[PDB]
């Protein structure tokens, strides 16, 4: 009934299930849980892995020796439930030195100072076999217009991703790089806000092989943005290295609902896209249980996410395979859209009378799409009415 | 006091003085104006040129004679002026045929039609001595999930602007493209909806120097997006075209509101931007005249976008200018974010203990960024309350 | 197999199937539907009745003898095939004189115009037997600030409805008013822009039972509010006289899609409200198929409205019916919730040391609401996964 | 140049220039002040008076002699400036006790504490001269559908403002109380979301006349809603007793900018209305210094709220008195949108045949409006470019 495994590849950040419930108004509801607790509390909800920051793992200021005795103690952890680390990435935002940003802060020193504190991490990311690092500059962007030059930041942006890519090349590691795009929140405006602005901005890096995008499905959502069709984007182009999955009810603050919740249809369709297209990196969860629940509810929450992947799979699927939706699809041309334009070239074009001179406009624009019928065996099959 | 001359660059498409008021609820409250009557009274005002859609100067359906006599009749009142014609693009939105996309439609048929439709266009372009083609794709998108695979699609519009590429080349003709992104209406969603996304599909293009993009305001803030940001992206690409520019108040229908009108403050960090970076492009508004208004109010709108940019240029430019603006950025330590982090070089960085480990993370992050008095000074400068 | 039958009490707008395409930018898709048609084909789906505004039924400038005809042809398409019209409204937004509104236009002479085609079609609509009037003011508002005075625009607001109940009262006639709100388009702003706005106003009217409101999903959602809150709120007001049903994606223009598209999860939980609260108007749908669809697909659109609420209705009954789920709502105390916070009364409150004095803070704020296992009972069974 | 005075009435909550700049991602970045810091500074600024929460003067959990002691010093700094406290409020949001809500959690024993917390600081704020007593229920509402039945929750609410009446009038206090809505943020959906929900809930209480509403600039504007309209509709209600003002950036988190930044046009129109209306209460400042700045940038964006209140108010009173601004406004039809439509009543109206029969409707629809002249030159009195 649903129960995911470790070979469906599901994954959660340990912010996620960690996370105590502190928000702009008000004050933490629940204590906070050790890494250990949370790995071994997933590994027996059938979870594959888990993912970090520098922080959540290390406290901030710790010693060499506290250091090394957090990372022991996580390792044996690992090894004794069999989970992995597929992705980890850097905390640029917590710390009040981080307030104008760490990469394109004004001030030089603090973005000297955030280039070390991510190459550090990277180095224990390999130790632990991660092979996804993410980058989210929750801190780069401005509240006021004079604040920041936007081309000078791209600049500095750009200085730090080709320094890092650098590094990774020097040490011959094998890790690559994921942005993770934001339109807003902490900042008033975020640079690179949305999937399309972060694949613009690696085409002009030194080695864009090494960088591609994580997406967020809320983070699209609060532009108000076709998360699937972003998805689909960054699958054409190449580039997607690692998703984030959740949910969000529209435009307004980051809620990182559990997966399923938010918007029901666009989980339908990302579902069908990440199969068809044979997606296979980490499911991974980036949500956080509501303030209002207790720990039972934490496991609760997140269950249903990997529970609600599963329910969606099954439905897509059956979907895809139903004889008279393989049939909507050809009466709705998809097979059509899929052949070339002009395959016969500009000139065999260009002379072709039944391209324009001879085309008939009114008959071809009398042809229904019956794409209303196809999105009703949609639904149908979502509901499991058939 | 702020009267605009052929020196200014301010140009206008026919479609906006043009409007004659039909919108999704209503008729229209306008007679239709004759080109060349617009091209004489945009001359008046002090406009420098004009820009157009195919449909716009010829009828749909027109036979060749009928169509040689609308240019002949439009280059007479351009010769009588001395306006100009620095852009042109296509109409593949309002036709039913159209429906389901021109180059991204479903019907191969109707994807050869799109082309050989604006093939026949740009040959006029050529003629009237434009620089830049414009494709706005209105009707590249879906209603539903299962209407469009975006990946094929994707496919279909590469080929589309590598055949247009193909062809220029061919000609020899001395004219680049823009792509404009707009997020969603008339469709639910459309493909490339935002700047970043326009400016990442351009790089897989096989000949991606003749692509750039034209930017209007109000799209942008139809996805909630920073538009100043977006521009600033677009010129530090090198991909700045051309640009479109109106008034939007907020995430909603498509506006087109006169320049000024809508986000103020935004529009004087655009032009901010644009002076200061030296863009040399038309200064092109793509605008609706509300449909409360006879064509006294068309005038007097189409002469207020010209008068809101240049007491904008006047104010963004006094800002600049004053001493006590140039010493609160470098009190921001705007100086600061202009020069390299690490000229020094990766390993330099690494080896440099005042950027790690010695570094004092308590000093730096109690360091006011003032930008508050920073932006009271260009809330200052905006009102002319210096 | 969730047949629809007129015992489900199903209608739509004679304006909703016979919409013929046309957009802001694009002409009409499809042909016009003659309403005896639409009667007819609408019987056969299983439909209850149909509504409309004047201008659907008798064509704008049509003589006395036209105007008799038009009704005489329609009176007998009902009687034919058993279907009522529950519910008329008036066109007060089409036609270029309300260009600046109806009720509120600053002409004075417009303004008494609005009001006699109004009572001309209250006559109507009692003739053939609605119980309901509409009025949706979607030009009552504007695109700048000076152009309308918002006090006297409600003044003028006020004098309109309080005429319209003095008429009805007069002639003796059995028939409510509803108003529907939206918050933008066609206008910049419409005032009265959600359902709060609209209940708040008709207190202030001089007879204030004989209005309520009818809201629409797509226009609360516009405004990106919740709408089975905003029925809530009708609801225990004792003013939900109708209701429009449809689909929309977020803050964007009006999509008007069918019934169960958008936003999923919102139409169940609404659904599950109609159906718990015993609301016995119609369930109407104020819907447009797409402009890519021919006839079949407006039918097939037709039919999946009544499908979807079908569906929704079986798994809402079910979800309530649940024993795991009842005991679920009592785990999160929705049985306390019902009950009076202090039936006690205020001194027995002031003097109750248990609800302060002696109150365990933090004991009760351990413990969980438990809500995340209730909404995945929810999920589950939306999605028939129990 | 611009310098408030006492006179003038500018306020600020004491969590205001207090904010230590705590973010749903990042620790604070300035130290707490000391409310009597807070007063002295706000008093040498120009300011009239301060306002607070509970929990702003008194820290939560305070025995009874700390509690006299905290009053005690805030008494003595009002004492030594001058400074009024013309508004307070409580805290129902920052405990996790209140995780579900204040007035309407589902835990009985938790409503009961709610009530009791407010009554003992009614009696505090009566002691300090208040005039107001504002509720903002930032708690109350819901991230999911099943966890709220909202007609209860309004049961519940209704209750919780029927005792506070009970309780002022009992002990004969000349206090009025006033709702502050909110979308959503910290909650999902917040209950009465806008001010018209607002509204319209009054009017079901037991001595409507003690409730009125405290409007905020920024979230009516994260709805997407004119401010100005809004308020407009709270003066014609005779509700409006209190007004928060600041800044927001659109749709998105709610961002409480200084007063001025943000929709400049919005303020503009904002400052016309207070002021043409003779609104005579507090001028209150809600807003939270970016947490960029250091205390210099506190007291500097302090300022700048009162500053833009000033230049805004010359604007205004110059666009009303400039005789060309008169004639427009005439052109415009504004005269006659104040006068009655049918002073001579329904049956005059029903008898003239000017209003229907003999109505030249193509005529009227001819007639421009001049609205965009009129918003040029509300433009240029802004920008002081007359
Ligand atoms: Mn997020
Ligand atoms: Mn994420
Ligand atoms: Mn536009
Ligand atoms: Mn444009
Ligand atoms: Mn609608
Ligand atoms: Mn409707
Ligand atoms: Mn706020
Ligand atoms: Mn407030």
Request: charged fraction near 30%; proline fraction near 5%.
């Amino acid at each position: 009934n649903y129960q995911p495994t470790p070979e469906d590849r599901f994954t959660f950040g340990l912010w996620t299930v960690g996370w105590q419930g502190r928000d702009p108004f008000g004050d933490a509801t629940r204590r906070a849980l050790d890494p250990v607790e949370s790995v071994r509390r997933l590994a027996e909800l059938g979870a594959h892995g888990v993912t970090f920051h520098d922080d959540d793992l290390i406290p901030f200021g710790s010693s060499d020796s506290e250091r090394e005795e957090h990372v022991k103690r996580f390792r044996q952890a690992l090894d004794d439930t069999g989970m992995k680390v597929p992705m980890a990435t850097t905390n640029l935002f917590t710390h009040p030195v981080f307030k104008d940003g760490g990469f394109t802060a004004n001030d030089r020193d603090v973005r000297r100072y955030a280039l070390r504190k991510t190459i550090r991490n990277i180095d224990l990311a390999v130790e632990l076999g991660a092979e996804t690092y993410v980058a989210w500059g929750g801190r780069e962007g401005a509240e006021s217009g004079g604040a920041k030059d936007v081309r000078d930041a791209l600049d500095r942006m750009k200085e730090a991703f080709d320094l890092l890519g650098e590094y990774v090349t020097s040490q011959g590691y094998d890790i690559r790089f994921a942005i993770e795009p934001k339109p807003n929140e902490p900042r008033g405006d975020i640079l690179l806000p949305t999937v399309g602005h972060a694949l613009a901005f690696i085409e002009r890096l030194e080695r864009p092989e090494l960088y591609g995008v994580n997406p967020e499905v809320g983070h699209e959502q609060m532009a108000g943005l076709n998360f699937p069709h972003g998805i689909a984007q960054a699958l054409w182009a190449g580039k997607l290295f690692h998703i984030d999955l959740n949910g969000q009810n529209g435009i307004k603050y980051d809620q990182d609902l559990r997966f399923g919740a938010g918007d029901l249809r666009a989980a339908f369709w990302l579902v069908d896209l990440l199969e068809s297209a044979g997606y296979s990196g980490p499911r991974h969860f980036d949500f956080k249980p509501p303030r209002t629940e207790d720990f039972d509810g934490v496991w609760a929450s997140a269950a249903g996410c990997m529970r609600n992947y599963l329910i969606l799979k099954e439905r897509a699927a059956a979907f895809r395979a139903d004889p008279e939706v393989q049939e909507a699809l050809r009466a709705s041309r998809l097979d059509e859209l899929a052949r070339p334009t002009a395959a016969d070239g500009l000139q065999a074009l260009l002379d072709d009378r039944s391209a324009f001179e001879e085309f008939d406009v009114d008959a071809a624009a009398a042809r229904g799409m019956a794409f209303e019928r196809l999105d009703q065996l949609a639904m149908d099959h979502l509901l499991g009415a058939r």
